[PDB]
Symmetry: D2
Subunit: 331 residues, 4 copies
């Protein structure tokens, strides 16, 4: 299928030679090739899109990115730097590349302000944030976005009417030491990433973010970070036990997945898991994505192009869902 849209596509600042090497050392077998591809915006990246039937990709800042910076001023400075950099880096290819906002999430008002700046000034398609914001004097704290103090931020997101992509980040500090350091090969795609995002996303659900912000659209990669596997189980325990006991979210987990949540196929090129999600989530709420350069185009697009499923859903998941959600023009 031609004209596919992908939206979990990363880039790194070229000056961060060491940080890119460190992250590559955890998640890529060819650090040099990885660095070249995660730094490149318009050369190899578009060549890959042209070979593999991708018409448009929305770019986002590499993880852990700004969420790893626990000094508020330093984090804000990096976010502004990244936003200006990518807006300028993509400007010559408005029909092939868009961008998500990079944000410091230390302060709701500041984050809302920066999102508004780059959405209005640059036409950014939304925000992509790498899970909780590292905070505290030594970076051992975590900022979740499901508390009431974030209403001012979510109100800006819905005012702009753009989606928010809740991307994983690596575990750090005391949490890392107590749970992951002794089983470190599980860090990232294998397990740690999904546990972080699903905890955060279900916090937004049960702490009422989608009740206070009904128009809010949150996107999850990797076919929903475990959640669809337990859709029956979560629904059963929410509706039959936890809600009778005090849980006060207004809707069912299935209603939130029909109105507020999206999942993408990033780094999860599983025909098996996709069919299952056609039932549990539905083709109307599933988006193609790659997770480039951590995943390569050939893996993602060889798989998708070969999918033997009905033409309607292949078109919706491949591009038409994203066209509608991100208000994309002809690209």
């Amino acid at each position: 299928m031609l004209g596919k849209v992908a939206l979990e596509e990363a880039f790194a600042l070229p000056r961060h030679k060491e940080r890119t090497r460190w992250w590559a050392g955890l998640f890529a077998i060819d650090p040099d090739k990885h660095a070249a591809e995660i730094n490149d915006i318009t050369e190899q990246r578009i060549k890959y899109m042209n070979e593999h039937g991708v018409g448009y990709t929305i770019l986002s800042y590499t993880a852990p990115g700004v969420q790893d910076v626990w000094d508020p001023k330093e984090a804000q400075a990096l976010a502004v730097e990244v936003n200006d950099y990518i807006a300028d880096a993509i400007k010559a290819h408005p029909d092939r590349l868009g961008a998500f906002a990079t944000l410091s999430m230390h302060d709701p008002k500041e984050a809302a302000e920066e999102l508004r700046r780059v959405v209005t000034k640059y036409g950014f398609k939304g925000a992509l944030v790498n899970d909780t914001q590292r905070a505290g004097a030594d970076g051992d704290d975590m900022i979740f976005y499901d508390g009431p103090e974030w209403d001012v931020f979510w109100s800006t997101v819905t005012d702009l009417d753009v989606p928010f992509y809740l991307h994983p980040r690596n575990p750090t500090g005391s949490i890392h030491e107590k749970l992951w350091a002794k089983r470190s090969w599980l860090i990232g795609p294998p397990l740690s990433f999904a546990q972080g995002v699903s905890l955060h996303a279900l916090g937004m659900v049960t702490n009422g973010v989608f009740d206070r912000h009904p128009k809010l659209q949150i996107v999850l990669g990797h076919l929903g970070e475990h959640i669809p596997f337990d859709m029956w189980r979560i629904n059963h325990w929410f509706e039959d036990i936890k809600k009778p006991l005090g849980l006060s979210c207004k809707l069912t987990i299935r209603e939130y997945f029909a109105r507020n949540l999206w999942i993408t196929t990033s780094g999860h090129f599983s025909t098996s898991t996709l069919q299952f999600c056609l039932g549990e989530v539905g083709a109307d709420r599933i988006l193609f994505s790659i997770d480039y350069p951590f995943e390569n185009f050939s893996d993602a697009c060889t798989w998708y192009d070969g999918l033997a499923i009905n033409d309607v859903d292949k078109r919706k998941i491949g591009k038409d869902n994203a066209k509608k959600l991100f208000k994309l023009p002809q690209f």
Copy 2:
């Protein structure tokens, strides 16, 4: 279907009135009914079994159980008490009831000794442990069982040739405060349980427990605690990325799921998810279970009995897999 076998089925010590009521208040809408049912061994429990085509159930000690006890001598004493108590309580119904060992997991050799004692003396069918063992001055530490220092225990498990059921437990201490306190309705079946078990189980994989103990059979509840959903993803990242980078487990994740791991249907009465795991895991490695009394017999068994699937897999998952894995003898309605 008659003669079904279920094996994530809990009991509590009757003397623990307050602890049982506390746990019941978190996970049951009728705490009084819950307490009565989790205390009962031979009356209502067998009556439910008779009404719902369950021939045999293997009983285990309630969570958090012994893994919540961070004083080693108190933990060992509780484990011995529970094992002696349940062994005596089921003695009249060898054709309907078995038991898993309850263990303090503070010390590998001590756990090995208690397991050998109760398997040999009472004919226990295996061990059921509620995730990590709380330890340290205030119980803020966690003992995982995937390090080599646990070899003496795992070698005892395979010597006895019985499975080990890795059950969840609630998050506690600093982990609870940092991650769960502000989103507490996710504690338990909704999310926290599976995250604990999957972390521990995949730690056993990547830290080589199944390479050092290739005969070891580990059972996971709730259709595998998320893992099958990511089977493709885990396999891809292990084989194509992590192993090139240094991960040295001998087999693929799919091979471990064919040789060492099992999943049960406990608390996951999802036709959708079961059909999915027929592909990712396979009917040979799936066991029926209920999670009684946190779940009720009617929900689990009306669902299972109504499954419109092939007769071979239905019989295997319903009872025949367990009959072989737990070397069960003829039990009530086991034949047909």
Copy 3:
């Protein structure tokens, strides 16, 4: 789910009551109840709808119906009689009952005129025809509708822009002797029904009916009469072998299923098969239906209401798909 729409729901003429009761005793286990229910339009039928969350049903003449009548003048008269009869029987319940046209299919122009007559005059929602029209001196010939002489009919269908439901009928005559008489328990739902409809439907595909009439909407019951099972196989052989050899239909089988063909859940209350069709066909092209009174409301609606699938597709299949396809009005009343 309330307000469901079902559209493979049969009725018979009261004057055939004795004949209806006799046949029901051969193919239904409670023939008296079956006969009473297939004859009833507004009492028990509406009662069942209210008790099982069905807001609207489109009625059709029971099979074999007019397609069993091989005399053209008798067949046309029966079609006219049935249409006038049902229009009058439902007139008091415009928010609960609609109807499909009953047609004699001996002559394309005659069928087109009767379809136009009842769609315009009575607001019928489409046509339901029971597979081929019996013809010939002894009724042993079969009229298929995929030949060029039927273009005049299909152009009227698209002019009116209403769907055509291709319903099965029993095998008759020499075909019945040669293939079915000695294995007669396969007649009907078990096998013969689907084999007839799939032959006719794929004949329309391969003979270009949907190329000449790109707006034509054909509805198939019973989750598509086998076809989705072989979607991969049919596509492979059409695209890679048959088309190179001469097959000249313009689109792929998947394109026709996205643009022209629909399936309903009539008499196929299979979560397994539905889940499979979510992939092969897609929730946008699947419609809930019952096959009453051959199936009962409780079987169909207990199954559908209990489906543990995503809310979007559940609403589409349950009622929203039909609302759009059949141009159903707002229902400013809810009796469920």
Copy 4:
């Protein structure tokens, strides 16, 4: 996966230039290549097996084959010629190739004798028959094998303990004229094949063949010729309606699929449909197969080798089911 077993793999008699060309003209786009491949036994065929991780294939006579021959004497002669021919053609590769019996099904006793003869003499692994036997003066009759007169044949099948593969055949005669001639592109894999086999197999079910012959193993190609799609529907109507009305088969349709029936992946390389059949039929009763040369090795084996399913079922379907069902000897890479 190495050491796969495939068992719906066709060959033709080289002397049959016109019949082979005719059949290929309906079902193959490269007539020259097709003719060369369906005639070759040990050259290109084994090379394909070596390329695609197939250790063993059980060969069978092309459709419609002997079931198209309505003269009993001619039919029997063709069956014997084919059987002797293939046994001799494969004798040099006992580690790569086996064969199914080709039979004339005009007479139960005669078919029984020929099956025993070649199973005993040549070590054939079973029988493969292309649906009903054409009969009658002009070949317009069809012999189904679900009548009581076939008990003597099925008893020999169970005496030998070899499976029976029920393969499709093209529609002919008045049935062809009335139903298929005006929509002829549906003939074969598209539709006509499954309709024939499914009618015949479900005839065996409802007419009690598996009740009189409980050890009988029948194999169906193409993931079961539609039947698994309607398993729920067939079961519902059999158990809740037809049996109360008079259907007298002893077991449910699901029980017959657990005890007597098998399906293969021949010409149905659909991950979707296979996953569905893991539920409706079960990996213990599914066999890998290709339908060569109508299908090519690369299509079937690239698909199977790439299947992202659990290791137990992949090896069972890929080879271990067939190794036990057909009592296969050690073959190339079978371990």
